Design an enzyme around this catalytic site. Structure first.
Site, PDB file in Angstrom:
ATOM      1  CG  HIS A 109       3.265   1.412   9.041  1.00  9.62           C
ATOM      2  ND1 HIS A 109       2.686   0.648  10.030  1.00  9.62           N
ATOM      3  CD2 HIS A 109       2.327   1.554   8.075  1.00  9.62           C
ATOM      4  CE1 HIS A 109       1.448   0.344   9.680  1.00  9.62           C
ATOM      5  NE2 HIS A 109       1.206   0.882   8.498  1.00  9.62           N
TER       6      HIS A 109
ATOM      7  CG  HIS B 136       3.173  -2.878   8.059  1.00  8.50           C
ATOM      8  ND1 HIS B 136       3.471  -2.250   6.868  1.00  8.50           N
ATOM      9  CD2 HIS B 136       1.870  -2.607   8.311  1.00  8.50           C
ATOM     10  CE1 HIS B 136       2.397  -1.627   6.419  1.00  8.50           C
ATOM     11  NE2 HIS B 136       1.411  -1.828   7.276  1.00  8.50           N
TER      12      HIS B 136
ATOM     13  NE  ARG C  34      -6.823  -0.476   1.890  1.00 12.12           N
ATOM     14  CZ  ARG C  34      -5.912  -1.064   2.661  1.00 12.12           C
ATOM     15  NH1 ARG C  34      -6.081  -2.321   3.050  1.00 12.12           N
ATOM     16  NH2 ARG C  34      -4.835  -0.395   3.049  1.00 12.12           N
TER      17      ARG C  34
ATOM     18  CE  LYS D 289      -7.331  -0.875   5.827  1.00 15.15           C
ATOM     19  NZ  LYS D 289      -7.159   0.594   5.999  1.00 15.15           N
TER      20      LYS D 289
ATOM     21  CD  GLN E  47      -5.309 -12.608   4.402  1.00 17.05           C
ATOM     22  OE1 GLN E  47      -5.384 -11.421   4.086  1.00 17.05           O
ATOM     23  NE2 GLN E  47      -5.303 -13.013   5.666  1.00 17.05           N
TER      24      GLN E  47
ATOM     25  CB  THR F 228      -0.905   0.048   1.246  1.00 18.49           C
ATOM     26  OG1 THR F 228      -0.095   0.088   2.427  1.00 18.49           O
ATOM     27  CG2 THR F 228      -1.808  -1.174   1.293  1.00 18.49           C
TER      28      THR F 228
ATOM     29  CE  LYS G  29      -2.158   8.765  10.546  1.00 21.23           C
ATOM     30  NZ  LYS G  29      -2.266  10.046  11.296  1.00 21.23           N
ATOM     31  CB  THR G  30       3.866  10.253  14.965  1.00 19.35           C
ATOM     32  OG1 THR G  30       5.026  10.007  14.161  1.00 19.35           O
ATOM     33  CG2 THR G  30       3.666   9.098  15.934  1.00 19.35           C
TER      34      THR G  30
ATOM     35  CE  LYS H  96      -6.732   6.786  13.914  1.00 20.07           C
ATOM     36  NZ  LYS H  96      -7.202   7.344  15.220  1.00 20.07           N
TER      37      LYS H  96
ATOM     38  CG  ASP I 261      -6.315  -5.972  10.643  1.00 20.71           C
ATOM     39  OD1 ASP I 261      -5.342  -6.431  11.276  1.00 20.71           O
ATOM     40  OD2 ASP I 261      -6.209  -5.469   9.506  1.00 20.71           O
TER      41      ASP I 261
HETATM   42  N1  LIG Z   1      -0.454  -1.661  14.840  1.00 14.58           N
HETATM   43  C1  LIG Z   1      -0.378  -2.950  14.519  1.00 14.58           C
HETATM   44  N2  LIG Z   1      -0.206  -3.877  15.472  1.00 14.58           N
HETATM   45  C2  LIG Z   1      -0.128  -5.164  15.173  1.00 14.58           C
HETATM   46  N3  LIG Z   1      -0.217  -5.580  13.920  1.00 14.58           N
HETATM   47  C3  LIG Z   1      -0.385  -4.712  12.911  1.00 14.58           C
HETATM   48  C4  LIG Z   1      -0.470  -3.354  13.191  1.00 14.58           C
HETATM   49  N4  LIG Z   1      -0.618  -2.717  12.034  1.00 14.58           N
HETATM   50  C5  LIG Z   1      -0.620  -3.632  11.068  1.00 14.58           C
HETATM   51  N5  LIG Z   1      -0.485  -4.850  11.592  1.00 14.58           N
HETATM   52  C6  LIG Z   1      -0.436  -6.121  10.831  1.00 14.58           C
HETATM   53  O1  LIG Z   1       0.723  -6.179   9.978  1.00 14.58           O
HETATM   54  C7  LIG Z   1       0.303  -6.574   8.659  1.00 14.58           C
HETATM   55  C8  LIG Z   1       0.247  -5.329   7.768  1.00 14.58           C
HETATM   56  O2  LIG Z   1      -0.067  -5.631   6.405  1.00 14.58           O
HETATM   57  S1  LIG Z   1      -1.477  -5.624   5.891  1.00 14.58           S
HETATM   58  O3  LIG Z   1      -1.578  -4.679   4.730  1.00 14.58           O
HETATM   59  O4  LIG Z   1      -2.415  -5.187   6.978  1.00 14.58           O
HETATM   60  N6  LIG Z   1      -1.856  -7.127   5.391  1.00 14.58           N
HETATM   61  C9  LIG Z   1      -3.039  -7.416   4.853  1.00 14.58           C
HETATM   62  O5  LIG Z   1      -3.940  -6.597   4.665  1.00 14.58           O
HETATM   63  C10 LIG Z   1      -3.210  -8.876   4.441  1.00 14.58           C
HETATM   64  N7  LIG Z   1      -4.452  -9.017   3.666  1.00 14.58           N
HETATM   65  C11 LIG Z   1      -2.010  -9.295   3.586  1.00 14.58           C
HETATM   66  C12 LIG Z   1      -2.041 -10.779   3.217  1.00 14.58           C
HETATM   67  C13 LIG Z   1      -1.876 -11.746   4.207  1.00 14.58           C
HETATM   68  C14 LIG Z   1      -1.880 -13.096   3.868  1.00 14.58           C
HETATM   69  C15 LIG Z   1      -2.049 -13.480   2.542  1.00 14.58           C
HETATM   70  O6  LIG Z   1      -2.053 -14.801   2.215  1.00 14.58           O
HETATM   71  C16 LIG Z   1      -2.218 -12.514   1.554  1.00 14.58           C
HETATM   72  C17 LIG Z   1      -2.213 -11.163   1.892  1.00 14.58           C
HETATM   73  C18 LIG Z   1      -1.069  -7.222   8.858  1.00 14.58           C
HETATM   74  O7  LIG Z   1      -0.920  -8.532   9.413  1.00 14.58           O
HETATM   75  C19 LIG Z   1      -1.649  -6.278   9.910  1.00 14.58           C
HETATM   76  O8  LIG Z   1      -2.702  -6.950  10.606  1.00 14.58           O
END
Ligand SMILES: Nc1ncnc2c1ncn2[C@@H]1O[C@H](COS(=O)(=O)NC(=O)[C@@H](N)Cc2ccc(O)cc2)[C@@H](O)[C@H]1O
Ligand SMILES: Nc1ncnc2c1ncn2[C@@H]1O[C@H](COS(=O)(=O)NC(=O)[C@@H](N)Cc2ccc(O)cc2)[C@@H](O)[C@H]1O
Lengths: 318, 318
Positions: free
Chosen positions: A44, A47, A85, A81, A175, A39, A234-235, A231, A196
């Site tokens: 960050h 992730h 998007r 969400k 997924q 994205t 982000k800051t 959240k 999520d």
């Molecule tokens: N603040 C946070 N605390 C803990 N975990 C967090 C977070 N912010 C993001 N994450 C996690 O870190 C990852 C960030 O990537 S993500 O864009 O959210 N990933 C997704 O949306 C999934 N659909 C990606 C995906 C996963 C598996 C697949 O087979 C295919 C695709 C996700 O697992 C999200 O849940």
């Protein structure tokens, strides 16, 4: 054994089967994975939580599988969400995908022998898969009736003006297949991610069953958020990225130094690899002591080192 | 003009924009189409109704486009269907597609001049279409919120005894694109079919406007049924197919000759090309005459000739 260790650090939101999973992990080293969708041209703080967990599993003797959504990044995950998007260009995403694969590599061991990490991209199979093949072979295993009642998309179908295109509505299947696809070729019996992603993991666990008759597992990690409920990742006008070009190593180290006392310790359990003992010992330390809490200093030096190595660490002090 | 003419013989149940369609048809010759999904190695009397309307439209100077769902035949149209339509092998559907295509050819003129019919197959653009391309390029234009309230599928959803898969739930999009695709390569501005296809036609009208900013139209013929109410084109030997091998011309002729007095006339308006006048003059004829209604005779004579020609007609008399 391991699951309980993570629970101690508070990195365990939910588990699909806490016993069978705990048992499988006992039988021997397993292979798990976590997905990361493009994205942006960099990940960050948010992730960094799941990614770090993979390493935790690896140090436990397990084989991590960091996957990049080169395909799913072209549709968009609607999970909890608020709104639709953006549909990034196929080129822009490719550019990002290549930046993520390289940004994730350093965080994992890719030659430790047995449990060597492995980089995967769902575009490999979805990027040349026919539409009819998709709908038939994968779609037939999904009930629209139950797809609607999934929390991850609930509000988006009931609410006032929160809608959802057929595009992001099918994300779940994508997924879902990913899990089975990884289980079929790599024997991945476990998937982890944010709270999520529970709905997406579930679908992956179910499909894998009716596709390969294999009992797979899922483990979500709690979404990190500052004590002051604001959240994370982000800051101000710039979410703390991992790319030193988007967030100077100096600006990175500073972010941690500014961590609130109500978090600092919780953050240490989430972003570092310090034994829960030396962490609690640090808290009990800052308590009795009448000096300033050195927890932040520790938290800053640790994470900065993990993401930018000794180099960036010394860069955040000049 | 032509629209009302079809109304005179009750061959029009609904019309998207009767006014505009009226003016457009008057402006000059247009290109229409009607799809026929391969769910068997042959078509039946039910499928014959829409097919004939294409020729009626052709005799008016318009160009008909008989399309065979070589792709949609693998998905399955759930329009007003209570149960999930099982999936047939690509090998079987392909084998049925050929039969249907050749079975349809005779009914239309493929070399009369400018209004020559066209044989289309949605597998041409759906067979080599990447899933990712479909989901975003087309799916982004569809809202799950409104796909759910569609009459054609509202049955399979709001029930606890029924259910619809993601496979058939995505059918609408496939047919929707077909209309847009045809309009972009042949200029097809009209699509006809049974009342049950209204939902699929509408979706194809909005999609064409959202992708090509063009105003196409849709016209559905009433699902012809027997006076008593029972399903049409269904007997003891199953259904009445257009394929001689499945239903002998003799058995085909007997089905018509045995038409109820309350349907024989309607059927003449539906299955033959006799002017609404001579049809009425025939009804008025039988009305007052000690003789027996020769409408059945005329009916079996006309239709049997349209489906099996002279050969099959003389075959029914021996
Ligand atoms: N603040 C946070 N605390 C803990 N975990 C967090 C977070 N912010 C993001 N994450 C996690 O870190 C990852 C960030 O990537 S993500 O864009 O959210 N990933 C997704 O949306 C999934 N659909 C990606 C995906 C996963 C598996 C697949 O087979 C295919 C695709 C996700 O697992 C999200 O849940
Ligand atoms: N008894 C009947 N009376 C009048 N019309 C009837 C009928 N029985 C069937 N029909 C119509 O004749 C056709 C029979 O073929 S069909 O298998 O039902 N066609 C379909 O299901 C369409 N979805 C096929 C299709 C159409 C257009 C596309 O772009 C793609 C596919 C349909 O238009 C159906 O509505």
């Amino acid at each position: 054994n391991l699951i309980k260790q993570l629970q101690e650090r508070g990195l365990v939101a939910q588990v699909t089967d806490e016993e069978a999973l705990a048992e499988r992990l006992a039988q021997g080293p397993i292979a798990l994975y976590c997905g990361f969708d493009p994205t942006a041209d960099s990940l960050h703080l948010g992730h960094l939580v799941p990614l770090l967990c993979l390493k935790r599993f690896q140090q436990a003797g397990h084989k991590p599988v960091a996957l990049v959504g080169g395909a799913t990044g072209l549709i968009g995950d609607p999970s909890f969400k608020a709104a639709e998007r953006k549909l990034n260009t196929e080129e822009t995403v490719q550019e990002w995908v290549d930046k993520i694969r390289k940004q994730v590599a350093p965080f994992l061991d890719f030659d430790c022998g047995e449990n060597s990490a492995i980089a995967a991209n769902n575009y490999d199979w979805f990027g040349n898969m026919n539409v009819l093949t998709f709908l038939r072979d994968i779609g037939k295993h999904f009930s629209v009736n139950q797809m609607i009642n999934k929390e991850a998309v609930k509000q988006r179908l009931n609410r006032e003006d929160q809608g959802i295109s057929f595009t992001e509505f099918s994300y779940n299947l994508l997924q879902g297949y990913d899990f089975a696809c990884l289980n079929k070729q790599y024997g991945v019996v476990l998937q982890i991610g944010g709270s999520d992603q529970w709905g997406n993991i579930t679908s992956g666990i179910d499909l894998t069953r009716r596709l390969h008759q294999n009992q797979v597992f899922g483990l979500t990690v709690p979404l990190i958020t500052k004590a002051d409920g604001t959240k994370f990742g982000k800051t101000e006008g710039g979410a703390v990225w991992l790319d030193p070009k988007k967030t100077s190593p100096y600006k990175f180290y500073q972010f941690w130094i500014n961590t609130a006392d109500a978090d600092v310790y919780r953050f240490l359990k989430f972003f570092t690899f310090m034994s829960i003992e030396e962490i609690n010992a640090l808290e009990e330390e800052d308590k009795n002591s009448g000096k300033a809490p050195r927890a932040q200093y520790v938290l800053a030096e640790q994470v900065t080192r993990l993401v930018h190595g000794e180099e960036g660490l010394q860069a955040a002090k000049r």
